[PDB]
């Protein structure tokens, strides 16, 4: 996720997201609120990382 | 002494291969004055040793010595300081080295500039500071 938001690469994001989804089967929701703390506020230096999200 | 002499070294050349030789052998000195003698002979060779003999044997010779000054941009605080200050006159008297000199500096900026929005100290102040054996010196005055 860190490398994906640094490079502004969506393929690695899709890998990470679906990996936590399979780890769940509310671990998705846990990881999503973990993102909301100091990841999803500013994914990249530019706030276009939210627009790519 | 050298502002006076240098009119020689535009004409004579054997003497100029004596000079940059001496300034270079001073850069790697014990005495603290010798580093700064090097800077000053080099900063002035870069200043009045062309605006931009052949132009190509000066635009290269300025980029030769200026690479030997990226050692001095590494050297201790005072000797750096003299380069921040003398390079403005090198720019006035030698305009075309602007592009090269900019990258020489802008590299030295980025060693202490963190270019991310939402990192609140934008600059690295604690890497300007050398602490060894409780002698805590600023070197690279930002």
From Swiss-Prot, chain A:
PTM entry text: Phosphorylation is required for the formation of the nuclear complex. Not phosphorylated in cells derived from groups A, B, C, E, F, G, and H.
Compartmental location: Nucleus; Cytoplasm
The protein's role, per its UniProt record: DNA repair protein that may operate in a postreplication repair or a cell cycle checkpoint function. May be involved in interstrand DNA cross-link repair and in the maintenance of normal chromosome stability.
Subunit composition and interactions: Belongs to the multisubunit FA complex composed of FANCA, FANCB, FANCC, FANCE, FANCF, FANCG, FANCL/PHF9 and FANCM. The complex is not found in FA patients. In complex with FANCF, FANCG and FANCL, but not with FANCC, nor FANCE, interacts with HES1; this interaction may be essential for the stability and nuclear localization of FA core complex proteins. The complex with FANCC and FANCG may also include EIF2AK2 and HSP70. Interacts with FAAP20/C1orf86; interaction is direct.
Disease per record: Fanconi anemia, complementation group A: A disorder affecting all bone marrow elements and resulting in anemia, leukopenia and thrombopenia. It is associated with cardiac, renal and limb malformations, dermal pigmentary changes, and a predisposition to the development of malignancies. At the cellular level it is associated with hypersensitivity to DNA-damaging agents, chromosomal instability (increased chromosome breakage) and defective DNA repair.
Stated name of the protein: Fanconi anemia group A protein
Gene name of the record: FANCA
Portion of the full-length sequence here: 415 to 473 of 1455
